Curated annotation (Swiss-Prot):
Keywords: ATP-binding, Isoprene biosynthesis, Kinase, Nucleotide-binding, Transferase. This is 4-diphosphocytidyl-2-C-methyl-D-erythritol kinase. The keyword Nucleotide-binding applies. GO terms for biological process: isopentenyl diphosphate biosynthetic process, methylerythritol 4-phosphate pathway; terpenoid biosynthetic process. ATP binds at P94, V95, A96, G97, G98, M99, A100, G101, G102, S103, A104. GO terms for molecular function: 4-(cytidine 5'-diphospho)-2-C-methyl-D-erythritol kinase activity; ATP binding. It is an enzyme of class 2 (transferase). It catalyses: 4-CDP-2-C-methyl-D-erythritol + ATP = 4-CDP-2-C-methyl-D-erythritol 2-phosphate + ADP + H(+). The active site is at K9, D136. Pathway: Isoprenoid biosynthesis; isopentenyl diphosphate biosynthesis via DXP pathway; isopentenyl diphosphate from 1-deoxy-D-xylulose 5-phosphate: step 3/6. Its EC number is 2.7.1.148. Belongs to the GHMP kinase family. IspE subfamily. HAMAP family: IspE.
């Protein structure tokens, strides 16, 4: 048996190019792995099987439409084998939480099998396979913090001097990325929504391990569109900052909010206040950067 621990991610910086055709938006983003994790345990078995436990687990498919299932099939095919493995996923990354939990699970399966089968292909081969499964899977392998400058680009590693402290808050329903992109386009047509600065100063603040320096640089060009669709996001973000967070942004298309705090102490205090206020379904504290998918039991 092999168990692999793997983190969810937050987007610290998300710049969205103007719409081209076929209506694609170029992105550059800073990914940040934090200590909300899934652990996936994999064992040799007679046939491929998949099972999940944890808060939202009930809802997820346990067949081919689950990325973790696809990962086991890809890994097996990569080495000419049948995916004769049982997969057990212990989820603490909130379901539909916008932290790429499904991608984290796929990354974890690649690692678990790599080790369980004593293949030990290089991590670079795993990330090659991860790119085939989905755009967030390679980061769940990489972990830490990384700059992603475009669709097919390799991740650039960003190392931090210090740990950062986060409050993550989740809504009871998601926001379709499609609908958020449409609104951002619309907002850019009728007006001039906030455009971010450059990625470099963000990496420099991360590298300095300095939350005061990083806080004003956090940003998401999709946030204005998400907030437009639900003005409540804007109140939640203000509530977190008023509770003491240095800054708050929505991560991704939303509605998940990430709050940067000064310390573990402040994060707990902010998280408890937000939790009490009931502006969100779920509140958790976390730290980053944390490592990507890795064996923790063998």
């Amino acid at each position: 048996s092999v168990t692999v621990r793997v983190p969810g991610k937050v987007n610290l910086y998300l710049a969205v190019g103007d719409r081209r055709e076929d209506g694609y938006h170029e992105l550059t983003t800073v990914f940040h792995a934090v200590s909300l994790v899934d652990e996936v345990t994999v064992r040799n078995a007679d046939v491929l099987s998949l099972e999940l436990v944890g808060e939202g687990a009930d809802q997820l498919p346990t067949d081919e439409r689950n990325l973790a299932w696809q990962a086991a099939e890809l890994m097996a095919e990569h080495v000419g084998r049948a995916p004769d493995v049982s997969i057990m996923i212990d989820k603490s990354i909130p379901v539909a939480g916008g932290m790429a939990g499904g991608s984290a699970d796929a990354a974890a399966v690649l690692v678990a099998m790599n080790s369980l089968w004593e293949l030990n292909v290089p991590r670079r081969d795993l990330r090659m396979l991860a790119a085939r499964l989905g755009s967030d899977v390679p980061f769940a392998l990489h972990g830490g913090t990384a700059l992603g400058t475009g669709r097919g680009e390799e991740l650039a590693t960003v190392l931090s001097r210090n740990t950062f402290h986060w409050v993550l808050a989740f809504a009871d329903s998601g926001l379709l990325t499609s609908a958020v992109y449409n609104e951002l386009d619309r907002l850019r047509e009728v007006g001039d929504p906030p455009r971010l600065g450059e990625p470099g100063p963000v990496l420099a603040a991360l590298a300095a391990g300095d939350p005061d320096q990083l806080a004003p640089l956090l940003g998401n060009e999709m946030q204005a569109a998400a907030v437009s669709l639900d003005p409540a996001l804007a109140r939640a973000l203000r509530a977190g900052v008023e509770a003491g967070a240095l800054a708050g942004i929505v991560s991704g298309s939303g509605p998940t909010c990430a709050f940067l705090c000064t310390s573990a102490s402040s994060a707990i205090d902010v998280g408890a206040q937000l939790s009490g206020a009931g502006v969100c379904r779920t509140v958790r504290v976390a730290t980053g950067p944390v490592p990507g998918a890795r064996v923790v039991s063998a």
